[PDB]
């Protein structure tokens, strides 16, 4: 309730760039603190590349912020090395146009991970259009830049990892290990893949397109009955296995006959630890997931969004509203039944499309959470709800409701479709919250302040 909603900072990118589609905090040190903003439809100077997408670096400080693109990749497509002879002349081996670079943006320390889940390539064998996805990783204050496309492998096409779209979702662990979701692997079974930054750097060679990282962790191909599950549609990280190695939370929103489920994987050997099931066909349970201790006992708790969840009003009318489920971790494990649920109230609002830990906004000993409903509000511009933590979990009522102060346009704002909280930008001891509104190419930064 102590977010400064009257006077947020508004960041603006190129129109039509989907600036705000993904947002993140960057803090090598607090001195170089900044906001990162993905703009996956941005045009770049990469030769031959149309709407390659960009990531913007927005310095934080006293003066009005101005954002600039980060140069992860200034080149166009590499060439099929066998083509430069032939007769057809040069042929690209990869396809960077419309790749949505910046669709996902994450940072840990002085490292930044940016993904292009619609990046595709030819393979060097028979010509395909495999959207394997790719990521770029800048490390050590932009001094070194690595590409990581673990689904760009020797197993091609939809039967293999050709349609993986690795980086569709992504997160860093507390140690900086990279965790990627790729929902397209093995006829859309989906896949989680993970490697340390050292492993990625150790085997990075832009000469070769297939850069097998040794020691990589990845989920295994399953039988056909698991096809079209979209494991890795979303991912988060938290500790659910009792040790000091963060585990992988992953949405499987089309699993089990489209009822969906969410899985937690052991962060040491990526083996399955827990599943949590959706309650309604095609509610998209696992559209978004989050992990954070919301009741102060030091155990990470699970949050899952199902933004298409349909309920019935008292007078018998079905309505799409969306729902978020919370599962509290206990020392003996985690129960499969939700501890509590929160249901949206705006029809078609897509409550639960995005989730973020806020840390402890009011400093009462309990961490709080923000939940987006990108089409909520009276003019369907979108809304972000703040819910307080507490000894029994989250409150049933929002403690703050955030809404864009600008007027609606002819197209949706998507306010609250992207969220990032739980970091302190200005360092006033209060956590701050970044909200994307990519429909109008904006991102909003809310500062936490002392309030009673």
């Amino acid at each position: 309730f102590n977010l400064d909603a009257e006077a947020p900072a508004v960041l603006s990118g190129p129109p039509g760039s989907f600036f705000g589609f993904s947002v993140e905090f960057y803090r090598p040190g607090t001195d170089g603190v900044s906001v990162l903003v993905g703009a996956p439809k941005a045009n770049t100077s990469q030769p031959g590349v149309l709407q390659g997408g960009a990531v913007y670096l927005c310095p934080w400080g006293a003066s009005p912020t101005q954002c600039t693109p980060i140069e992860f990749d200034s080149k166009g497509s590499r060439l099929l090395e066998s083509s430069l002879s032939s007769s057809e002349g040069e042929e690209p081996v990869e396809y960077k146009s419309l790749q949505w670079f910046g669709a996902t943006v994450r940072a840990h320390g002085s490292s930044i991970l940016a993904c292009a889940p619609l990046y595709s390539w030819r393979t060097e064998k028979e010509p395909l259009s495999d959207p394997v996805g790719t990521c770029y990783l800048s490390t050590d204050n932009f001094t070194r830049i690595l590409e990581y496309a673990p689904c760009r492998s020797d197993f091609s096409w939809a039967a293999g990892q050709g349609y993986c779209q690795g980086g569709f979702s992504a997160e860093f662990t507390k140690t900086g290990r990279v965790v990627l979701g790729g929902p397209g692997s093995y006829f859309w079974q989906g896949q989680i893949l993970s490697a340390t930054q050292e492993q990625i750097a150790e085997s990075y060679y832009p000469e070769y397109l297939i850069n097998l990282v040794q020691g990589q962790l990845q989920t295994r191909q399953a039988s056909s009955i698991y096809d079209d599950s979209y494991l890795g549609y979303s991912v988060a990280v938290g500790e659910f296995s009792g040790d000091d190695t963060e585990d992988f939370v992953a949405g499987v929103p089309k699993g089990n006959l489209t009822y969906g489920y969410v899985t937690i994987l052991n962060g040491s050997d990526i083996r399955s630890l827990y599943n949590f099931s959706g309650e309604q066909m095609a509610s998209y349970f696992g559209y978004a997931v989050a992990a954070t201790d919301v009741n102060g006992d030091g155990l990470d708790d699970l949050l899952v969004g199902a933004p298409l969840l349909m309920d019935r009003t008292p007078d018998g009318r079905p309505q799409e509203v969306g729902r978020v489920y919370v599962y509290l971790q206990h020392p003996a494990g985690i129960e499969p039944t939700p501890t509590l649920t929160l249901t949206g109230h705006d029809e078609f609002g897509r409550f639960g499309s995005s989730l973020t830990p806020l840390g402890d906004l009011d400093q009462d000993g309990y961490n709080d959470v923000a939940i987006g409903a990108p089409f909520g509000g009276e003019t369907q511009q979108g809304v972000v709800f703040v819910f307080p933590g507490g000894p029994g979990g989250l409150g049933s009522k929002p403690s703050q409701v955030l809404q864009p102060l600008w007027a609606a346009s002819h197209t949706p704002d998507f306010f609250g479709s992207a969220l990032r909280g739980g970091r302190d930008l200005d360092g006033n001891g209060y956590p701050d919250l970044i909200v994307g509104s990519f429909g109008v190419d904006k991102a909003v930064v809310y500062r936490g302040r002392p309030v009673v």
């Binding site: 619609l118 959207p131 349609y163 397209g184 006829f187 079209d228 549609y233 089309k254 018998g316 799409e320």
Partner: protein, 424 residues
Amino acid sequence: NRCLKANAKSCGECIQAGPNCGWCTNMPTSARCDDLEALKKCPPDDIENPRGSKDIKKNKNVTNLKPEDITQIQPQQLVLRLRSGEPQTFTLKFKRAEDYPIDLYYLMDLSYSMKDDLENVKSLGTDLMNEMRRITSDFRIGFGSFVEKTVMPYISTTPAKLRNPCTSEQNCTTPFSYKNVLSLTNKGEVFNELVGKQRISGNLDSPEGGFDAIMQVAVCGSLIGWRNVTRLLVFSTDAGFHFAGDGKLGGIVLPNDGQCHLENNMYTMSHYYDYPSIAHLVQKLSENNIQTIFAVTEEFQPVYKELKNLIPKSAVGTLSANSSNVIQLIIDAYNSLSSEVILENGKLSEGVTISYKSYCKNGVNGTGENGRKCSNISIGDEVQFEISITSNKCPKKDSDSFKIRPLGFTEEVEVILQYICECE
């Protein structure tokens, strides 16, 4: 009592304090608001006591011949004057029409596994027309096809696979989202001729784009040619279905807008709007009085049986591997759909509540949400519903209105509510 204990300062307060409260105008002042019997224990003319009422406006008799002029629901309009807390009850009569017209739109999956089906469906026009004579004197049929959103990753996008999404030997036409091949017509031979001219297609991922197409058929109105009659949509496929959220893979994030985007009988916006959610389809199918028949293979019965449970006025039947059995499938699904009526009401105001009791054949009587339902309704059968509406402590300052209707019917009952919150 509560009339006194309400301390009604005025007449209005007295009325809103309970439906048994009267207010004298001729010992505290609040004692003028007592029970109607208590105030007498005051001249009966000096007692202010506005009671509720039901007043029928339109009440055309159930019929026993254009679709406009046939009545299955009665009454069609009435006014309910509501004393706060006092329910008003009226009766709805439903009689299943004898020879009611049917529009059937055949919406078909044309990905490659349906090639053999297509070769049996190309004679469905005249065969179904023939079979429909034992059901109706007035049948029209139409045909539409669907495959998939025409973007990565749902289709391969090499120039060659764009031309031919299948193998080189197989001569598949380019992938497409939705084609209205034939708007509704009574000419079965035209159905046969056009369906026999359609080319099978292909795409990459197993679940298909049919929800995009269902939406268009529901909302495109005169382009499809729907009359105000029984509207049957046969959705035929041997695969699961994409829905809202799946678009994000292909960078499609804008929700389906539920509006018609047919140009030259082609859905042009599959690259721009996400697949519909189930909830969105529930809305637009119901609004447009579409009854849906999921004609799908045995492999996908489990999926579509669940879908059916969410989509009002829908049925699922098991399609053979080449659609050889689809006529009987349609007849059996139509018989299921037609033998049951389900009442839905529009939105009520805050403080207003509605209750249904149903009275069906063989003395099966429903209450709660089963009060909105009557099952096993034969042609010419009459069933009745007692509907009760109650307002609380005066919402609004003017009157409201809402519609009650059986799903899949154009016919409806307009209920106008007037709230008694004053006197005279």
